[PDB]
Write a protein that holds these residues in place. Structure first.
Motif, PDB file in Angstrom:
ATOM      1  N   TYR A   1       0.821  -1.282   0.199  1.00  0.00           N
ATOM      2  CA  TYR A   1      -0.396  -0.107   0.309  1.00  0.00           C
ATOM      3  C   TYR A   1       0.364   1.435   0.103  1.00  0.00           C
ATOM      4  O   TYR A   1       0.718   2.407  -0.408  1.00  0.00           O
ATOM      5  N   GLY A   2       2.169   1.222  -0.091  1.00  0.00           N
ATOM      6  CA  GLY A   2       2.780   2.490   0.648  1.00  0.00           C
ATOM      7  C   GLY A   2       3.662   2.932   1.336  1.00  0.00           C
ATOM      8  O   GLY A   2       3.388   2.444   2.231  1.00  0.00           O
ATOM      9  N   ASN A   3       3.948   3.834   1.524  1.00  0.00           N
ATOM     10  CA  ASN A   3       5.055   4.446   2.564  1.00  0.00           C
ATOM     11  C   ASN A   3       3.916   5.379   3.700  1.00  0.00           C
ATOM     12  O   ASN A   3       4.705   5.449   4.859  1.00  0.00           O
ATOM     13  N   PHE A   4       2.289   5.569   3.570  1.00  0.00           N
ATOM     14  CA  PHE A   4       2.208   5.596   4.941  1.00  0.00           C
ATOM     15  C   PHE A   4       1.871   4.555   5.838  1.00  0.00           C
ATOM     16  O   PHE A   4       1.321   4.584   6.986  1.00  0.00           O
ATOM     17  N   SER A   5       1.710   3.264   5.039  1.00  0.00           N
ATOM     18  CA  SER A   5       0.887   1.730   5.885  1.00  0.00           C
ATOM     19  C   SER A   5       2.057   1.623   6.447  1.00  0.00           C
ATOM     20  O   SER A   5       1.755   0.385   7.200  1.00  0.00           O
ATOM     21  N   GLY A   6       3.782   2.389   5.625  1.00  0.00           N
ATOM     22  CA  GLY A   6       4.552   1.393   6.863  1.00  0.00           C
ATOM     23  C   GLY A   6       5.688   2.735   7.677  1.00  0.00           C
ATOM     24  O   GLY A   6       5.951   1.791   9.297  1.00  0.00           O
ATOM     25  N   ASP A   7       4.134   3.780   7.759  1.00  0.00           N
ATOM     26  CA  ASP A   7       4.234   4.612   8.826  1.00  0.00           C
ATOM     27  C   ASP A   7       2.819   4.026  10.028  1.00  0.00           C
ATOM     28  O   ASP A   7       2.993   4.434  11.073  1.00  0.00           O
ATOM     29  N   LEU A   8       1.912   3.322   9.678  1.00  0.00           N
ATOM     30  CA  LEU A   8       0.473   2.790  10.860  1.00  0.00           C
ATOM     31  C   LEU A   8       1.208   1.667  11.516  1.00  0.00           C
ATOM     32  O   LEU A   8       0.513   1.405  12.441  1.00  0.00           O
ATOM     33  N   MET A   9       2.850   0.223  10.663  1.00  0.00           N
ATOM     34  CA  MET A   9       2.947  -0.832  11.128  1.00  0.00           C
ATOM     35  C   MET A   9       3.646  -0.354  12.310  1.00  0.00           C
ATOM     36  O   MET A   9       4.122  -1.066  13.781  1.00  0.00           O
ATOM     37  N   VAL A  10       4.422   0.582  12.284  1.00  0.00           N
ATOM     38  CA  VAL A  10       4.874   0.974  13.429  1.00  0.00           C
ATOM     39  C   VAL A  10       4.209   2.019  14.552  1.00  0.00           C
ATOM     40  O   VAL A  10       4.643   1.135  16.049  1.00  0.00           O
ATOM     41  N   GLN A  11       2.948   2.176  14.767  1.00  0.00           N
ATOM     42  CA  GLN A  11       2.021   2.464  15.796  1.00  0.00           C
ATOM     43  C   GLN A  11       1.741   1.262  16.454  1.00  0.00           C
ATOM     44  O   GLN A  11       1.247   1.599  17.593  1.00  0.00           O
ATOM     45  N   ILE A  12       2.048   0.403  15.720  1.00  0.00           N
ATOM     46  CA  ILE A  12       1.770  -0.658  16.498  1.00  0.00           C
ATOM     47  C   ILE A  12       2.786  -1.860  17.254  1.00  0.00           C
ATOM     48  O   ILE A  12       1.992  -2.417  18.464  1.00  0.00           O
ATOM     49  N   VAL A  13       3.853  -1.480  16.236  1.00  0.00           N
ATOM     50  CA  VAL A  13       4.677  -1.935  17.511  1.00  0.00           C
ATOM     51  C   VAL A  13       4.990  -1.711  18.722  1.00  0.00           C
ATOM     52  O   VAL A  13       5.922  -2.140  19.553  1.00  0.00           O
ATOM     53  N   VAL A  14       4.794  -0.400  19.130  1.00  0.00           N
ATOM     54  CA  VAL A  14       5.066   0.437  19.859  1.00  0.00           C
ATOM     55  C   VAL A  14       4.052   0.344  21.112  1.00  0.00           C
ATOM     56  O   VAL A  14       4.071  -0.536  22.389  1.00  0.00           O
ATOM     57  N   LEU A  15       2.436  -0.649  20.531  1.00  0.00           N
ATOM     58  CA  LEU A  15       1.685  -0.808  21.757  1.00  0.00           C
ATOM     59  C   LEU A  15       1.861  -2.062  21.694  1.00  0.00           C
ATOM     60  O   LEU A  15       1.276  -2.814  22.474  1.00  0.00           O
ATOM     61  N   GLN A  16       2.628  -2.627  20.851  1.00  0.00           N
ATOM     62  CA  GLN A  16       2.962  -4.192  21.711  1.00  0.00           C
ATOM     63  C   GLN A  16       3.744  -4.467  22.345  1.00  0.00           C
ATOM     64  O   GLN A  16       3.652  -5.122  23.458  1.00  0.00           O
ATOM     65  N   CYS A  17       4.708  -3.401  22.208  1.00  0.00           N
ATOM     66  CA  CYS A  17       5.926  -3.365  23.734  1.00  0.00           C
ATOM     67  C   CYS A  17       5.335  -3.189  24.525  1.00  0.00           C
ATOM     68  O   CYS A  17       6.676  -3.186  25.143  1.00  0.00           O
ATOM     69  N   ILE A  18       4.890  -2.363  24.471  1.00  0.00           N
ATOM     70  CA  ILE A  18       5.060  -1.548  25.359  1.00  0.00           C
ATOM     71  C   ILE A  18       3.493  -1.711  26.656  1.00  0.00           C
ATOM     72  O   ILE A  18       3.507  -1.191  27.560  1.00  0.00           O
ATOM     73  N   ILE A  19       2.808  -2.641  25.960  1.00  0.00           N
ATOM     74  CA  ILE A  19       1.423  -2.813  26.648  1.00  0.00           C
ATOM     75  C   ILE A  19       1.271  -4.248  26.872  1.00  0.00           C
ATOM     76  O   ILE A  19       0.797  -4.717  27.175  1.00  0.00           O
ATOM     77  N   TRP A  20       0.571  -4.752  25.302  1.00  0.00           N
ATOM     78  CA  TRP A  20       0.882  -6.373  25.327  1.00  0.00           C
ATOM     79  C   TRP A  20       1.292  -6.989  25.908  1.00  0.00           C
ATOM     80  O   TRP A  20       1.723  -8.742  25.747  1.00  0.00           O
ATOM     81  N   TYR A  21       3.404  -6.999  25.501  1.00  0.00           N
ATOM     82  CA  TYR A  21       4.287  -7.724  26.403  1.00  0.00           C
ATOM     83  C   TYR A  21       4.155  -7.813  28.013  1.00  0.00           C
ATOM     84  O   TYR A  21       4.803  -8.125  27.516  1.00  0.00           O
ATOM     85  N   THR A  22       2.786  -7.070  28.163  1.00  0.00           N
ATOM     86  CA  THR A  22       3.347  -6.604  29.696  1.00  0.00           C
ATOM     87  C   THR A  22       2.346  -7.098  30.346  1.00  0.00           C
ATOM     88  O   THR A  22       2.679  -8.161  31.620  1.00  0.00           O
ATOM     89  N   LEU A  23       1.197  -7.033  29.783  1.00  0.00           N
ATOM     90  CA  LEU A  23       0.074  -7.616  30.591  1.00  0.00           C
ATOM     91  C   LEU A  23       0.111  -9.083  30.589  1.00  0.00           C
ATOM     92  O   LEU A  23       0.266  -9.900  30.850  1.00  0.00           O
TER      93      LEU A  23
END
Ligand SMILES: O=C(O)c1ccccc1C(=O)Nc1cccc2ccccc12
Ligand SMILES: O=C(O)c1ccccc1C(=O)Nc1cccc2ccccc12
Lengths: 379, 115, 379, 115
Positions: free
Chosen positions: C125-147
């Motif tokens: 899909y292009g270079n904007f959807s690679g900017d949305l996947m980084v926003q999901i990597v942030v929420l896994q490392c800091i919330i859903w891998y701690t719960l």
């Protein structure tokens, strides 16, 4: 002279190399992360996959139709002046050997050009001198690391005949070697055997044990044992397919497609990072840095940083180089010693302690030496 | 030095004969007693037989040939004789000696065949 | 619809990932280069140095002041619908356990986002959807891998009390743990000991051997054992210093200097190449790919590729996403399973064979599945 | 279940006396004979003494206390007595019992001090 901004461009390209080397020294010596058997599987990866793809990335982008032929003949004249003075030593002095003819050629005339030499000279002088260092990496991989392989195989194949045929070897007709054997340097038991014919002839056959000759014969035994060591080497497929593609890509303007160009570039981006990581693991596994005494370590850093750049000052002035091409040639001669002259001398046991100081204790003092010619030349 | 081996004793014999092989060494430097004898069938994977090694104390025989093949040292004539006894019919192959002066030297000239 | 040129952009970004994975499978299974102890020192490097610096390169370039807040709430609503239906199963059905509440949460709602997910969606899909996947990597490392780390430590700390205090544990006042112990999941001998006081009270102390409680006490034992597992983790310093720099760099426009930015970028270029190399070594060391039977392997690829992207179709339509932001959200739910849910389940022994099929047999069939939604959505 | 330990036998004695410690267990589920006794000096690195384990066959004594400290089982009164003999002066520390019902339970109330 040089300006103060140029000292920041040199440190931008070289301080990232020592950071990846102290993290690997500290994780074994200080904080003890890697077992010495786990630490052997990282050097096995860098030697086979990371560095033979780093050298493909550089040689395939070389343009062999526009090389600098006058700079490249002042590099091939250094290694003839040196290799001929050692020939007037073991043939005229009485205590000259061939164990020292190999070691004094590896110290003085073979530096570290691929990992350290390309980022260093590109920051000191710019993007044209990083295009000249690739022209030197081509001539080491394809000529000067093959002549040096003919010397280790001649040194080993004359021990095996002069020990086992002391009074008879003048009548040997032909020497075969079974294909089980890959290096005849005493590591395997190496039983030999002769066929006595009807008129004083002799067929020698080298085998595997289980619990002077004419020069029409010695040159046949060496070419067999060199071909078996040359096809089991990763740096001879990085240079065979590196040069063959650059002869085709730069004439018909073929550009390599992005499926194949990214399949290579995913492992070769780990080239320059992991090579300096694998070089700091090795200085953590040796007992001491100076592993050969204090006399034989000053001898390893005086052939390397003095006799090196004082024989490319007379082999670059006797060709016609001036100005900046004289300054790039002297500085690349003062680089620390490469690693492949240590890989050979550890296997064949031709002074493995003098060539392990000069790789390790070369790197630690290489940066205040090359920044000392860079100030003195620019004045 | 014009080194030369001389081998003899080959001949056709039945099962149960007695042969006396020969290996006359000449034209050498100072020799060590490490002479051998073995077989080479037209197939592969040859098998070693005997030894006349340093002191004459232990001789490396094989399993099936132990106590039946007499080996003898003669350092005066520089010739080791291998006396075969109760000759089994599976001895059609070539037999030859393997004198060791640091590198093994050998010839090919026999006529060993047991019928 | 899609054009035929788009199928070349997907293959340009993903065929270089499988090449580095078959070279590592072949060098152990087929051509036998690495000993299984040498092969353990490469996974030790990728887990500590290469990947925790690949995640710093992505999070430090995120702009946390311009995140997409509506896309990011349809991802945090998937993992509440799923985590509440499992709560109405182990509290209402009679054969519901906590061994399956962790495993059915790891399969259906935690994919491989960092290594495979960013290059795949950037090519589709292009270079904007690679900017949305980084926003999901942030929420896994800091919330859903701690719960998920609070669930493995609650599962282990209730076994140690329910086995050793079967009829007495209602009178425990406080539980200390000596600092020798880092994980109390049966690997160490774990002798326990009590202080009987004057009125039926009890002080439990967990020690190291040598040859229900109130919820004011159980919540104190867990926070001690979580803090000891959270500071010995490399992915909690990549996310602490990743987010802290991106909150400062994107407000006062500070740009990180080139000494420090190249000191990090020399090891993080080996991130995406060595991670797929370390992932093919692991599928060579297991006995079989399908290591859990044929019934429990279809169950691992039906929670992952069907129940995943059929609960972000109702959690992305009930928020307000349309068009392309609906299409990026469904495709990233069909990614194969990440590796950190396997690292936890191998240590704590909570089904380590069902989560080793789904990592290995996830990757091999992930590419014809995500290219099957990409055709069907675009129609 | 209101579990409670009762310890007694503490007192001041000279070098060469005879004391009789006590550990009266009460208020338990089904107990296993694994009761112990050990020392705790004001320093660190405590040392274990005795055992009254399952069958009364082998008792884990230490090196210096072997053959001189009598331990005794009484499952009727649920009390293990530790009889000390030839009391050395380095027994100023606290002594207490370590009854094991799956998790070790213990108290603190003694007055063991040898002068
Ligand atoms: O550094 C050299 O000697 C060299 C010079 C020119 C071309 C290639 C090389 C070279 O293969 N190096 C290395 C080989 C194996 C491991 C190495 C590890 C680190 C650095 C260089 C290595
Ligand atoms: O892939 C994941 O699970 C993941 C997702 C989001 C953020 C980080 C990760 C992650 O740390 N992976 C890995 C950890 C250790 C080794 C890994 C090897 C390969 C790939 C990922 C690895």
């Amino acid at each position: 002279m040089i300006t103060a901004a140029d000292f920041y461009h040199v440190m931008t390209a070289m301080v990232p190399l020592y950071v990846a080397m102290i993290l690997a020294y500290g994780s074994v010596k200080w904080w003890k992360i890697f077992t010495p058997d786990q630490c052997s599987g990282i050097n096995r990866f860098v030697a086979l996959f990371a560095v033979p793809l780093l050298s493909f990335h550089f040689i395939a982008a070389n343009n062999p139709y526009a090389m600098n032929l006058r700079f490249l003949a002042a590099d091939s004249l250094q290694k003839v002046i040196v290799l001929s003075l050692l020939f007037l030593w073991c043939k005229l002095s009485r205590n000259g050997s061939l164990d020292w003819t190999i070691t004094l050629f590896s110290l003085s005339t073979l530096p570290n050009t691929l990992v350290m030499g390309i980022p260093l000279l590109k920051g000191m002088y710019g993007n044209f001198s990083g295009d000249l260092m690739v022209q030197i990496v081509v001539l080491q991989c394809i000529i000067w690391y093959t002549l040096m392989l003919f010397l280790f195989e001649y040194r080993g194949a004359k021990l095996l005949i002069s020990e086992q045929f002391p009074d008879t070897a003048g009548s040997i007709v032909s020497i075969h070697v079974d294909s089980d054997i890959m290096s005849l340097d005493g590591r395997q038991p190496l039983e030999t055997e002769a066929e006595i014919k009807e008129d004083g002839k002799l067929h020698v056959t080298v085998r595997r044990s289980n619990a002077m000759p004419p020069t029409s014969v010695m040159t046949r035994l060496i070419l067999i044992m060199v071909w078996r060591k040359l096809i089991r080497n990763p740096n001879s497929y990085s240079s065979l397919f590196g040069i063959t593609w650059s002869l085709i890509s730069f004439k018909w303007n073929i550009e390599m497609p992005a499926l194949i160009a990214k399949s290579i570039s995913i492992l070769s981006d780990a080239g320059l990072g992991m090579a300096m990581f694998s070089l700091g693991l090795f200085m953590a596994l040796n007992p001491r840095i100076i592993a050969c005494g204090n006399r034989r370590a000053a001898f390893a850093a005086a052939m390397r940083f003095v006799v090196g750049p004082a024989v490319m000052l007379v082999a670059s002035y006797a060709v016609g180089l001036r100005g900046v091409l004289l300054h790039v040639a002297i500085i690349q001669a003062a680089l620390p010693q490469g690693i492949v002259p240590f890989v050979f001398a550890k296997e064949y046991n031709v002074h493995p302690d003098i060539l392990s100081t000069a790789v390790i204790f070369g790197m630690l003092i290489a940066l205040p030496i090359t920044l000392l010619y860079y100030i003195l030349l620019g004045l | 030095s014009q080194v030369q081996l001389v081998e003899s004793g080959g001949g056709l014999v039945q099962a149960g004969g007695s042969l006396r092989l020969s290996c006359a060494a000449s034209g050498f430097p100072v020799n060590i007693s490490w002479m051998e004898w073995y077989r080479q069938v037209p197939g592969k994977e040859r098998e070693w037989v005997a030894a006349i090694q340093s002191t004459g104390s232990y001789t490396w025989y094989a399993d099936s040939v132990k106590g039946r093949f007499t080996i003898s040292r003669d350092n005066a004539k520089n010739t080791v004789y291998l006396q075969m006894n109760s000759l089994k019919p599976e001895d059609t192959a070539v037999y030859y000696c393997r004198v060791k002066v640091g590198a093994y030297y050998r010839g090919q000239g026999t006529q060993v065949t047991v019928s």
